[PDB]
Symmetry: C4
Subunit: 121 residues, 4 copies
């Protein structure tokens, strides 16, 4: 169900690193679209740092008049959720859009990945 995805967004968006991390199965992975290949894999014990570093990135974006807006997850059965994301300037300009994929197993996240429109570095 969507509860673990909701919990993840709320806790990770406030810096409750420990709650956010615990949304992931011990074998779960969070794939970010950076690095040599199509992405970089983060395991559960890499994910707390990742959250912290993405929060710091978000603050720089905000200071520039840009921020991401995440919609409530759309569930496809119990084990998959799609989250629409839109990155917008305060002037009303979409600068990026994408979909966060969540694959769940047993109420935990086993895969978080993103598909984005603009391949930002």
């Amino acid at each position: 169900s969507a509860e673990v995805i909701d919990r993840f967004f709320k806790s990770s968006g406030a810096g409750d690193i420990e709650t956010a991390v615990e949304c992931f199965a011990d074998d779960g992975q969070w794939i970010t679209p950076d690095g040599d290949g199509l992405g970089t894999v983060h395991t559960k014990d890499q994910i707390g740092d990742l959250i912290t570093s993405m929060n710091a990135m978000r603050e720089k974006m905000i200071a520039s008049g840009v921020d991401g807006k995440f919609e409530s997850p759309i569930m496809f059965g119990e084990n998959m959720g799609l989250v629409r994301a839109t990155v917008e300037t305060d002037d009303g300009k979409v600068v990026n859009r994408g979909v966060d994929l969540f694959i769940l197993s047993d109420g935990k996240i086993v895969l978080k990945d993103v598909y984005r429109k603009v391949k930002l570095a």
Copy 2:
């Protein structure tokens, strides 16, 4: 459910600006595929004007023998609907096609966005 999406198409297609606007949550956004970026964001109080201006555009299209045809929304659970759109000439020629995304929250539209085949200016 699809009722608010249906209400939106019927009212906005006839110029009932006030009913159409009220289909959107106060925090909702309607993204149009124009502007510097991947689109331009319209908030609820920008949406009435937008409807009026798109109706005027539609009349110019019709006078040229071109018009858009929208299918009934296909629901994915309660909170997402997809609307197929086809732009056709009176001679039977598809000139554009796309999908209108609706994300709902609490019976209101929180995101209307479009994906189109031809990136028309």
Copy 3:
């Protein structure tokens, strides 16, 4: 439901022009991926001829060792079905693939369109 889509494939695949045509609403359209634009629109009374001409095309393909294989439609609620198509040579070579979109209204087809991988003329 899928019955009208199944009926359409069975009847149109055997040349029962009248049954196939009657699967379409009077306002339905069948879009083929040929012509000046992204496709060409066929109304209900253009569709019988279209079926005949596509059957004749299919026979030429078969004589060349190529044929299309259609899977059973995958339903998304009552009013949308997706049909996977694969075009294969008798030597085991996929030469095209795509998805037939069916949008239904009231048990009739209101839109049949195709998305294909190879933009064959």
Copy 4:
């Protein structure tokens, strides 16, 4: 349902060639993204060899520090399942991703196909 897809992954991943093969209808096809065209068709009696040869390929990949990870299938009704695949290096680098399509009929696989991001030879 997903049972036949699960059975197929478990048995084919261990070399139980006979169980894996019997997951396919007698008319089923497994399409691999190699060959002259958009893929190559394997019938039921070609599929055992295919499994063996893909296992041997997998062992070479593993010896290079690369392996594929398959998620549990996401069902769309009874007759379609999507399986997310990610190919990763042991250093945490996604090198390929895709989706395995399964179309079922009567509890058997009638079509297995893949869509991949990187068109690897």
